[PDB]
């Protein structure tokens, strides 16, 4: 739900100025935001929590 | 006129200001 929230949130600004950006230009950025994950369990493999 | 060799430039001014423009390099 965050990328569906965040795409609406940026496009709320550009629609206010009447400027059209297609959503696939914003969805690429939010794809690059949510890549990583935090570590809560190392299991037994090398990941500092 | 206020300057003795001025060309006559006929003005549209409706007012009449008392203080003439100072010696602009005074600062």
């Amino acid at each position: 739900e965050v990328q569906i929230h965040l795409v609406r949130e940026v496009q709320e600004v550009y629609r206010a100025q009447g400027v059209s950006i297609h959503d696939k230009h914003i969805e690429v950025i939010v794809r690059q935001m949510l890549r990583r994950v935090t570590i809560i369990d190392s299991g037994s493999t090398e990941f500092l929590p | 006129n206020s300057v003795p060799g001025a060309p006559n430039r006929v003005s549209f001014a409706k007012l009449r200001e008392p203080l003439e423009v100072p010696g602009l390099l005074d600062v």
Binding site: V13, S20, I21, K24, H25, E27, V28, I29, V30 | -
Partner: protein, 582 residues
């Protein structure tokens, strides 16, 4: 693109040195360099021989987005200024108040091929951002086409069915005969006439009613109660294109070039846009758009509106003065009062102006400006912001044609310098945001043609109504258009409307809203499965081609430039940030 010869002689100096050695104009290349550096008049003919079919890259600094560098075949032009095509000025965002454009030069065969194929101007018409064309006509030629395509009732030599002692005397056997009757002072260009076209494609209505099965137009004939000007304008558009019979607002020209770029190949769009520029200029001179002080009319009932709102204001001032409401409440009340006064003054102005006024013509055609600039010209400047941001409750009540007074000018300067410094800082901050975004998303390049995934987001796509109607969502073209369908589209256990993996442009959306299902699960770069960059079916149609994106495209930098480019056009606000720092 034009090129000054005194600069192209210094660009192409090794090419021209080899070429003038090969014609034996100099013995060795040392004497060739001497001949160039003393500019002997063989070298201009050799440079003309050398330049032809060898593109050059033109950059206007700064390069905000992808269309800030565009390649052009040069041609030699005297003088010392780079002559530039009038349609790429929006693409560069270049005016002619002294802007300087850098000229680079490709050398290799690969570099010349890239400038000939990729970066040529005619192959870059649409936006990378939203697919609307940037080579669309603008400020001057839009007014030209608007005057050329408008229709004036009661014009010169109209069609009137004047049965009774004579026929109608408005029909014309040919556009050529109408052209002769227009050149002689009989026909006006914009009078409604009944021509007999044989060389234009009719609209779908008349094509269905007359032929339907085979409406091939080079042969047959038909009649069309249009103006002359719409015929003269539709002659610019290609042969397969139907008749338009409209009034060329800038919206309608954008829609025509959008459809024409979507359907026809790229060379036809380039030639048609060129023809539109030429006809637009030639009919922009004859339109008679001039600005005089007699062409700026203050509304005659302005004193009534300002007197009534002064009487509205002084009661609030009295109640604050002898202590009913406090300072913040009286400032809010006066702000409300003068906003009502401003809207009333602008309404009186808009109903007052006749539609052939050049100022309201420029405003209403879509050429330039909005109505607030006319309301500040004649009418009322309105409220002015403080250095803090609050509105001065006085406010300026004078129109610029009537000429401001001293204190009203001194109030206005606050808002003007505030907005101008805001534009400077906003340009710097948008440069920062574009750089940071490009540095983030540079890894995203289209590597696989298809990830063959099965996930994908759902688009709203025209939610319902209380009457059961599928009212169209306003922001479809920025969200749903040009995306490949991740799932199918079936309705009420009927047949499938759109199968999986369709580009989903306009007619599939028309079929979707006809069949009446709103949400579709479309594919996206959010749910793509390839690790090294996104696939190609998830990214969908690239806006700058009209076709599906290629297997090597750099979609990350295109996306980041498209986000951070219009940040210069982002107002701050009218806490919650609502501008560029939002």
């Amino acid at each position: 693109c034009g090129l000054p010869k005194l600069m192209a002689l210094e660009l192409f100096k090794p090419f021209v040195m080899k070429r003038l050695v090969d014609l034996n104009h100099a013995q060795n290349i040392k004497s060739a360099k001497r001949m160039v550096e003393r500019q002997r008049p063989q070298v201009w003919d050799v440079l003309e021989e050398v330049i032809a079919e060898h593109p050059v890259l033109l950059n206007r600094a700064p390069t905000l987005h992808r269309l800030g560098i565009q390649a052009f075949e040069p041609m030699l032009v005297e003088g010392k200024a780079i002559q530039l095509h009038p349609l790429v000025c929006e693409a560069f965002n270049a005016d002619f108040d002294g802007d300087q454009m850098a000229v680079h030069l490709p050398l290799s065969a690969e570099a010349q091929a890239e400038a000939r194929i990729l970066m040529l101007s005619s192959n870059n018409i649409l936006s990378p951002a939203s697919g609307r064309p940037l080579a669309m006509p603008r400020l001057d030629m839009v007014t030209g086409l608007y005057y050329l395509t408008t229709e004036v009732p009661g014009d010169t030599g109209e069609y009137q069915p004047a049965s009774g002692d004579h026929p109608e005397t408005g029909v014309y056997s040919s556009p050529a005969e109408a052209i002769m009757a227009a050149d002689r002072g009989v026909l006006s260009v914009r009078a409604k006439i009944k021509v007999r076209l044989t060389q234009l494609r009719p609209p779908v209505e008349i094509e269905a009613e007359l032929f339907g099965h085979s409406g091939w137009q080079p042969g047959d004939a038909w009649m069309a109660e249009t103006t002359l000007g719409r015929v003269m304008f539709n002659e610019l558009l290609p042969l397969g294109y139907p008749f338009v019979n409209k009034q060329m607002h800038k919206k309608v020209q954008a829609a025509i070039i959008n459809d024409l770029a979507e359907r026809y190949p790229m060379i036809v769009v380039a030639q048609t846009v060129d023809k539109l520029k030429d006809a637009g200029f030639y009919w922009a001179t004859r339109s008679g758009v001039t600005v005089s002080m007699a062409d700026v009319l203050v509304p005659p009932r302005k004193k009534e509106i300002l007197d009534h709102y002064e009487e509205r204001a002084d009661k609030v001032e009295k109640q604050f003065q002898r202590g009913a409401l406090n300072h913040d409440e009286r400032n809010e009340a006066l702000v409300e009062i003068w906003k009502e006064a401003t809207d009333e003054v602008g309404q009186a102005l808009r109903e007052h102006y006749p539609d052939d006024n050049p100022i309201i013509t420029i405003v209403d055609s879509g050429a330039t400006g909005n109505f607030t600039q006319t309301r500040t010209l004649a009418g009322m400047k309105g409220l002015v912001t403080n250095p803090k941001g609050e509105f001065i409750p006085r406010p300026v009540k004078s129109s610029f044609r009537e000429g401001l007074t001293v204190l009203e000018y001194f109030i206005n300067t606050h808002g003007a310098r505030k907005g101008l410094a805001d534009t400077a800082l906003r340009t710097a901050d948008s440069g920062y945001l574009t750089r940071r975004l490009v540095d983030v998303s540079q890894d995203v390049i289209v590597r696989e043609h298809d990830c063959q995934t099965e996930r994908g987001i759902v688009v709203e796509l025209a939610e319902r109504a209380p009457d059961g109607t599928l009212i169209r969502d306003p922001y479809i073209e920025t969200s749903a258009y040009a995306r490949t369908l991740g799932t199918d589209a079936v309705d009420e256990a009927g047949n499938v409307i759109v199968e999986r993996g369709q580009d989903l442009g306009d007619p599939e959306i028309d079929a979707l809203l006809a069949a009446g299902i709103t949400q579709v699960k479309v594919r996206s770069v959010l749910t793509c499965a390839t690790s090294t960059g996104v696939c190609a079916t998830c990214y969908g149609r690239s806006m700058a081609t009209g076709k599906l994106v290629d297997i090597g495209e750099a979609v990350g930098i295109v996306a980041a430039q498209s986000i951070g480019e219009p940040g210069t056009q982002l107002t701050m606000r009218t806490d919650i940030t609502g501008g560029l720092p939002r």
